[PDB]
Amino acid sequence: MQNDAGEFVDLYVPRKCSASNRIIGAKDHASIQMNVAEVDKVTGRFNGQFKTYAICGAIRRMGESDDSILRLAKADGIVSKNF
């Protein structure tokens, strides 16, 4: 995209897996996008905003979507370090 004139010549920009950085193709029906609802400090209730992750089909098929999600949440503070 983005020829030298500056305009974005592309009809859409595909997502990428947040675990393996691969392009999630339009026909990848094994790929998912999930949301984790982060809570507030004082009462631990859902506060409206959440956190988004995407897993491609191949990672979610070899069996390591679980570990990848856990690492992403650990990096983003959803899961404490003492895990």
Binding site: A19, S20, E64, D67, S68, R71
Partner: protein
Amino acid sequence: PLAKDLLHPSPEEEKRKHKKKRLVQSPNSYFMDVKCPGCYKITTVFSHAQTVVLCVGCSTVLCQPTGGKARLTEGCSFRRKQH
């Protein structure tokens, strides 16, 4: 597991790994102080001794070489050397 920390493996699996397949090679063998009975001096015996080491002053044999490690005779006290 995709995100195994190769650079910093914990000591237990490094000890479990083969000596050449460790991240940095480390011999499993070691040198040890061996006190033969009825003497005063301390002689050094390789933990994987291939020859019959002889306590010089005291007549009895120290270690019988076997397959992997030396076979210390009964009553022979041994101490490690700086791990």
